[PDB]
């Protein structure tokens, strides 16, 4: 991400950057110090914000690929930022929508004899929470 | 589209030298009457005065043509 | 205009020509030889497929199959001499009575 | 890759249309009839040029092909074959 | 609407000597005016060799359109190596007849004329300028529009234009200071500075002064019925080598 | 209905007529002349139910196109290709 | 209620669809027709295996495309194809010849002016949009993903009843409309048409996406763009957006390798070479030249118009060719504001300008960035040395 | 076919001199021994001149190209298609300048007459302005589909060749502006295979003609 | 009557719209 100084104001402005559009770098910049980004400390605040926002993507991608690698889940498909993710566990398949480090909504699509609505509901509820415990609880709920 | 092709059209809708000449003259009549309709349309276009012979001018030409014939 | 059309033949006289060239049978080839050979081949093909079509009529269906072909070739006693060495693919074998 | 393969299947199907317009052909039958003409072509041409070599004459020609077909075909089919070859080459030379 | 076409004359013919044989050739009598003008009166332009002699000749059986109104202009000067050129307007073919008479009569050989990009810019500068009755120069501003048409691989860049309204032209001229040829003096350097583009080098096709004239590769198109004298003087000075 | 004649054919025919008298035609004008050509043709079939030299000269005189057979073959001369108007002259 | 289903048959002119069909190769025809018979069958008598061998024997005999097309239009499905097949042929046409189609961008915004990153599950979206549209017009909707891009594409067509006709009871067709959705971005792509039907459509998408908070679409550009690849590159979620023109190498990101990379081949030891610039303006003044300096002059022009010495995509064709741009400079001189409006037209404006630079009609060192190609595809006004997109 | 074969075998190697061309073209129109379908083949596959056609031969040919009228009933008429084919052969190979303008009036010949009159309009003195009135009349006449483009070709020759005339150029603008037939008229065909035979007919015996 | 949608009427709407724009701008002026 690359920043330039205004001609008159002697203040930065966001000229060019590589950060994808789903990270609103312009909004972050305008928020920093009320938009009057001047100091290198303000610039590092902005840079740290975008960096944590990128790490919050790589942190999800890494754990999901780790789950795939150990065959804890079958094949999966990911959106670009790894916020919406779909995967088959063994035969059941799940749809998730995750914020940073946390699952906020879940959906289980397959129909199975033992997969009654009460069973479905409590599974779907248990799948919510922090992502670090998802691997453990999924392995426990293997069957 | 030839004038003899117009005669061919009138032959197609109608049904040898004598009949050939007859149908050629009928084609002449049809062409002349089309020209008369267009000329009366231009005359009506003169009464209104705008750029070109807009459709109601051909229309009015046809009613005058029928009212005189 | 094509050579087959000028001959009245359906088969590819030009292909027979070039194949005679490929088959290295002789260095000099008469121009009438390929057309004569193509006519002979067309006649034989037409005869055998007509026999197969009549066999299909006997079997009451409107598509030729290797069984029809095998029955026709084995039943025709002259073409059975011509192809006495051949056995047909999915062609079968003829009954004793 | 796969090169384009020689075939006479189109001509076979067309002559079947001339004979029985309503009739189709199975794929195996079509391969069979495609092999027919090549087998015949070989066993005519080899014999004909061998006969030419027996003549010790350079050219394989219409007389050689006529003799070869009438040698190798059974006689009943050979009469038809030679008549059709002769009339076909005559029609051609009349062009 | 008033177009023009210019031809060169290889000899300083005295047109008045021969008017009658033209008149009988054209089956009509044409007028012939005589003016000795001093067009480049500005000091840097000069005070000598200004004595161009101008002739107005007209084929007006009527003046209902350009073809009937079609008027010829001869302007020459004895000090000029090729002494005289010609101008005419309209689609009337009697122009061809009079040209044929000229070439057959005076033994003179004639050719058409072209313009360079710098010639076009100078001509546009000459088009805006007007002189008062007090022998004082003045300028009338028009919304200039430069219009180019380059040749590039795969038609990457077919055409492009630089439009300059009246206010921007006047502001640039005033910023450069009091001057007489603003298009060459101020506008083009400003364009080059802002874009690195050399208007002189680029393939110019037309210079349009809105509502006043269009200057083109082969012709001049004019709002007024006639061309002011500086236009003709610039043309003549462009004829030479 | 199969009676209609094409707009393009009318364009081609009337293009030559524009030179004798320049009629200029918008689109809906073309469509109306095409549409009313059917009515014109029916009216002509009423006016000319059968073809004869005296009948056709009389019909065209009634139409106001001509005043006599002289005017009629003048029209034929100005409306037909060169050899034909001579062929018709042999008929008159 | 009014939602259509795949087995319905519309009405249209046969010759137009025939000409559309003629564009396709033989193999895709074979595949499409096999699938159609598998799902719907046909008037032809025989098993699909019989159909398979007939189509085979037709193709190994080297039959022409006309025979297959005539068969499809006159024996297999003589009365007309289904809406599904009509959508499929246009899908294949778009995939085969992308450059024939035009698009426009549109930005999704929420109440506080922030960008709304649209995230879409197709099922909810399609059902909601179908239910919303069916209440006003008869609508068939077909959705698919591009074979080589991360975009979901939708085709929407509207129908109405019946010039005069008796009890045949068909529905006449109309020109189609298209919309696309990148996976994670605030941007929307759609066809270029301003008929009321397109407005109804776009309004329906805007209504249906929301589901938790209001959403509105704000156009960001007024001139269309072709070739969905290009518009995806320009405005889709990617590294090239806001790094266009001379800034493309950051989007490439191959110049820098990860830190643990070997020492001795880290490029820092090895370095590179470049040309020195000149600042006293000798351009307008004025073969007496040698190869090397000319080579690096051409490299200078290359990077100024492409951003990389190797010239990351002829030497003039640019990454995304631009057909039209309109600029408007506003500068202050002696407390007086001056306007210059440049208008360019062609197939690649900046490639042509690059060619002119190579021919030495334009001075490279005085070409501004906005003229070089940055802010690509955006016409706008430049004030205070900062580009501003036109409203 | 025996009689036609003799004509073929002679012309293919002997060619056909001017008097031989005069005798044969007379035979085509005056005798029934040659069938009409073969007349449209003999004129363009057997008429092989030794060189340029002499003036008297062209004048005698022109009598075949006339038409009967309510005056000239007694004249034997060559069919117009054969007349058109004969002109097409004339295209392959100084009062005659005045004669050929009135050949151009015929509707079925006029397209084939354009090169012939243009190949007479070869000097600034040959062209005259009043001739264009006749050319213009046919161009504006209904039933002459070829005349507009045919006339425009001749008009485009007169305007550049004349060098000194009144404003006849604007009369060119009156002719059909689509110019659909004029494109083919300015790109006439010499029938290469007929020419290639004629090349040998011009090479066998004699140079300089 | 006469049916047409071309010059001599299509410009009238544009003129009227710009005139209304001018009027609404003028309404806010002090005088």
């Amino acid at each position: 991400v690359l920043l330039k100084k205004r001609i008159k104001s002697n203040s930065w402005f966001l000229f060019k950057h590589t950060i994808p559009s789903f990270i609103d770098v312009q909004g972050i910049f305008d928020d920093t110090n009320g938009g009057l980004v001047i100091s290198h400390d303000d610039a590092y605040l902005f840079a740290k914000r975008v960096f944590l926002q990128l790490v919050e993507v790589q942190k999800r991608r890494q754990i999901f690929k780790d789950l795939e690698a150990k065959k804890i889940i079958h094949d999966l498909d990911l959106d670009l930022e790894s916020s919406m993710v779909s995967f088959f566990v063994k035969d059941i398949k799940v749809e998730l929508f995750v914020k940073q480090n946390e699952i906020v909504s879940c959906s289980i699509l397959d129909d199975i004899h033992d997969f009654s609505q009460n069973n479905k509901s409590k599974w779907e509820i248990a799948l919510l929470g922090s992502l670090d415990d998802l691997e453990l609880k999924l392995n426990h709920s293997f069957a | 589209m030839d004038t003899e092709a117009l005669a061919n059209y009138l032959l197609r809708q109608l049904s040898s030298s004598q009949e050939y000449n007859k149908k050629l003259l009928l084609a002449c009549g049809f062409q002349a009457i089309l020209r008369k309709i267009l000329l009366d349309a231009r005359t009506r276009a003169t009464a209104e005065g705008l750029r070109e012979v807009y459709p109601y001018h051909i229309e009015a030409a046809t009613q005058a043509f029928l009212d005189s014939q | 205009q094509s050579r087959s059309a000028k001959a009245g033949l359906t088969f590819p006289v030009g292909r027979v020509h070039r194949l005679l060239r490929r088959g290295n049978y002789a260095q000099r080839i008469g121009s009438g030889a390929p057309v004569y050979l193509t006519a002979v081949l067309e006649y034989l093909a037409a005869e055998i497929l007509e026999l197969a079509g009549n066999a299909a009529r006997d079997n009451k269906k409107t598509r030729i199959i290797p069984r029809h072909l095998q029955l026709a070739i084995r039943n025709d006693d002259e073409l059975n001499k011509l192809l006495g060495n051949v056995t047909i693919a999915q062609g079968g074998v003829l009954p004793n009575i | 890759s796969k090169a384009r393969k020689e075939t006479y299947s189109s001509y076979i199907y067309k002559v079947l249309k001339q004979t029985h317009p309503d009739t189709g052909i199975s794929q195996k039958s079509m391969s069979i009839l495609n092999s027919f003409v090549n087998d015949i072509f070989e066993r005519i041409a080899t014999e004909a040029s061998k006969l030419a070599a027996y003549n010790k004459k350079s050219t394989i020609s219409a007389r050689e092909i006529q003799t070869a077909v009438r040698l190798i075909l059974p006689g009943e089919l050979a009469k038809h074959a030679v008549s059709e070859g002769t009339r076909a080459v005559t029609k051609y030379s009349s062009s | 609407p008033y177009t023009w076409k210019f031809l060169g004359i290889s000899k300083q013919l005295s047109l008045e000597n021969g008017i009658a044989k033209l008149n009988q050739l054209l089956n009509l009598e044409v007028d012939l005016d005589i003016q000795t003008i001093r067009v480049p009166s500005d000091p840097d332009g000069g005070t000598a060799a200004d004595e161009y002699i101008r002739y107005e000749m007209r084929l007006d059986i009527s003046n209902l359109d350009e073809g009937t109104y079609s008027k010829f202009i001869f302007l020459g000067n004895s000090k000029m190596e090729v002494p005289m050129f010609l101008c005419y307007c309209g689609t009337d073919n009697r122009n061809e007849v009079v040209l044929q008479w000229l070439k057959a009569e005076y033994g003179v050989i004639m050719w058409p004329i072209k313009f360079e990009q710098k010639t076009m810019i100078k001509l546009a500068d000459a088009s805006i300028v007007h002189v008062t009755k007090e022998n004082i120069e003045q300028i009338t501003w028009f919304s200039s529009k430069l219009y180019f048409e380059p040749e590039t691989q795969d038609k990457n860049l077919r055409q492009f234009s630089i439009e300059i309204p009246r206010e921007s032209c006047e502001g640039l001229a005033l910023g450069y200071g009091n001057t007489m040829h603003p298009y060459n003096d101020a506008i083009v350097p400003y364009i080059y500075n802002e874009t690195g583009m050399a208007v002189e080098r680029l393939p110019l096709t037309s210079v349009i002064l809105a509502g006043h004239t269009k200057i083109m590769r082969e012709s001049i198109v004019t709002s007024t019925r006639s061309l002011r004298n500086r236009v003709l003087a610039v043309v003549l000075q462009s004829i030479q080598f | 209905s199969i009676k209609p004649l094409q707009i393009m054919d009318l364009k081609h025919l009337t293009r030559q007529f524009l030179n004798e008298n320049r009629i200029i035609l918008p689109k809906q004008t073309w469509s109306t002349i095409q549409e009313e050509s059917l009515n014109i043709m029916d009216f002509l079939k009423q006016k000319i139910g059968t073809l004869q030299k005296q009948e056709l000269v009389d019909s065209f005189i009634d139409m106001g196109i001509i005043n006599n057979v002289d005017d009629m073959f003048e029209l034929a001369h100005e409306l037909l290709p060169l050899e034909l108007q001579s062929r018709i002259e042999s008929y008159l | 209620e009014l939602r259509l289903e795949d087995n319905y048959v519309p009405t249209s002119d046969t010759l137009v669809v025939f000409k559309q069909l003629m564009k396709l190769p033989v193999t895709v025809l074979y595949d499409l027709t096999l699938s159609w018979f598998a799902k719907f069958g046909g008037s032809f008598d025989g098993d699909i295996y019989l159909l398979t061998e007939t189509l085979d024997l037709l193709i190994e005999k080297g039959v022409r495309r006309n025979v297959i097309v005539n068969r499809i239009l006159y024996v297999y499905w003589p009365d007309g194809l289904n809406v599904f097949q009509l959508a499929e042929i246009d899908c294949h046409l778009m995939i085969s010849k992308p450059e024939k189609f035009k698009w426009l961008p549109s930005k999704a915004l929420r109440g506080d002016g922030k960008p709304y990153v649209v995230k879409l599950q197709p099922a909810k979206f399609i059902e909601n949009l179908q239910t919303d549209l069916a209440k006003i017009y008869h609508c068939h909707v077909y959705m698919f993903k591009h074979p080589s891009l991360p975009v979901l594409i939708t085709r929407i067509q509207l129908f109405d009843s019946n010039l005069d006709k008796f009890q045949g009871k068909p529905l006449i067709s109309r020109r189609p409309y298209y919309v696309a959705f990148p996976l994670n971005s605030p941007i929307i792509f759609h066809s270029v048409d301003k008929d009321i039907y397109a407005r109804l459509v776009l309004q329906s998408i805007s209504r249906t996406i929301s589901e938790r908070e209001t959403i509105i679409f704000k156009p960001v550009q007024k001139i269309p763009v072709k070739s969905i690849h290009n518009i995806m590159t320009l405005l889709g979620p990617s590294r090239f957006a806001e790094s266009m023109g001379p800034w493309e190498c950051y989007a490439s990101a191959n110049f820098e390798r990860s830190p643990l990379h070997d020492y001795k081949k880290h490029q820092g030891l090895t370095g590179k070479k470049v040309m020195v610039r000149e600042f006293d303006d000798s351009f307008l003044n004025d073969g007496k030249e040698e190869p090397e300096i000319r080579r690096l002059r051409l490299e200078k022009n290359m990077i100024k118009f492409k951003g990389s010495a190797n010239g990351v995509m002829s030497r003039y064709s640019s990454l995304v060719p631009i057909e039209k741009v309109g600029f408007t400079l506003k500068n202050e001189i002696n407390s007086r504001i001056i306007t210059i409006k440049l208008k360019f037209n062609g197939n690649d404006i900046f490639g042509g300008l690059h060619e002119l630079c190579d021919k030495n009609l334009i001075n490279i060192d005085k070409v501004p960035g906005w003229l070089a190609g940055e802010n690509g595809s955006f016409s706008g006004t430049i004030m205070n040395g900062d580009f501003q997109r036109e409203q | 076919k025996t009689t036609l074969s003799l004509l073929y075998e002679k012309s293919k190697q002997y060619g056909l001199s001017s008097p031989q061309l005069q005798a044969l073209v007379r035979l085509l129109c005056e005798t029934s021994i040659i069938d009409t379908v073969t007349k449209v083949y003999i004129v363009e596959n057997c008429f092989l001149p030794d060189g340029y056609l002499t003036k008297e031969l062209l004048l005698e040919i022109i009598n075949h190209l006339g038409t009967p009228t309510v005056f000239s009933r007694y004249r034997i008429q060559t069919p117009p298609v054969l007349q058109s084919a004969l002109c097409k052969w004339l295209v392959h190979v100084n009062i005659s300048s005045s004669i050929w303008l009135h050949l151009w009036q015929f509707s079925f010949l006029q397209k084939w007459i354009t090169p012939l009159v243009i190949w007479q309009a070869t000097t600034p003195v040959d062209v005259k302005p009043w001739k264009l009135s006749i050319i213009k009349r046919c161009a504006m006449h209904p039933g002459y589909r070829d005349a507009p483009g045919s006339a425009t070709l001749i008009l485009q020759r007169f305007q550049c060749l004349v060098g000194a005339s009144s404003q006849i150029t604007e009369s060119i603008i009156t002719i059909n502006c689509n110019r659909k037939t004029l494109k083919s008229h300015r790109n006439l065909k010499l029938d290469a295979h007929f020419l290639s035979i004629l090349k040998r007919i011009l090479s066998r015996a004699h140079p300089a003609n | 009557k006469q049916r047409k949608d071309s010059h001599k009427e299509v410009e009238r709407r544009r003129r009227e719209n710009i005139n209304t724009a001018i009027n609404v701008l003028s309404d806010l002026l002090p005088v």
Side-chain angles (χ1 to χ4, degrees), chain F residues 27-76:
Chain F
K27 319 207 194 199
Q28 195 76 341
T29 307
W30 288 112
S31 69
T32 61
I33 181 59
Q34 177 263 319
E35 173 66 7
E36 294 184 325
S37 71
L38 285 77
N39 296 115
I40 289 288
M41 206 292 298
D42 182 39
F43 173 67
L44 295 171
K45 292 293 105 183
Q46 184 268 309
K47 294 276 263 191
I48 298 95
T50 177
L51 286 77
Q52 295 88 32
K53 55 189 285 184
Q54 304 309 119
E55 192 276 341
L56 63 93
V57 300
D58 288 350
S59 78
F60 302 157
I61 290 160
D62 176 27
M63 272 325 308
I65 307 158
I66 51 161
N67 303 274
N68 45 28
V69 66
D70 294 330
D71 286 355
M72 183 278 288
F73 60 70
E74 275 189 36
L75 266 286

Side-chain angles (χ1 to χ4, degrees), chain D residues 4 10 13 25 27 30, chain G residues 53 57 59-62:
Chain D
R4 175 58 171 159
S10 50
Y13 184 86
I25 308 170
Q27 192 42 41
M30 182 47 50
Chain G
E53 57 80 19
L57 191 144
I59 59 165
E60 291 90 6
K61 69 158 75 170

Side-chain angles (χ1 to χ4, degrees), chain G residues 43 68 105 137 172 244 266 305-306 318 327 358-359 373 384:
Chain G
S43 298
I68 298 95
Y137 264 116
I172 183 63
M244 271 289 315
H266 182 250
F305 278 92
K306 304 287 188 275
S318 62
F327 299 123
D358 279 4
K359 292 201 286 189
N384 315 302

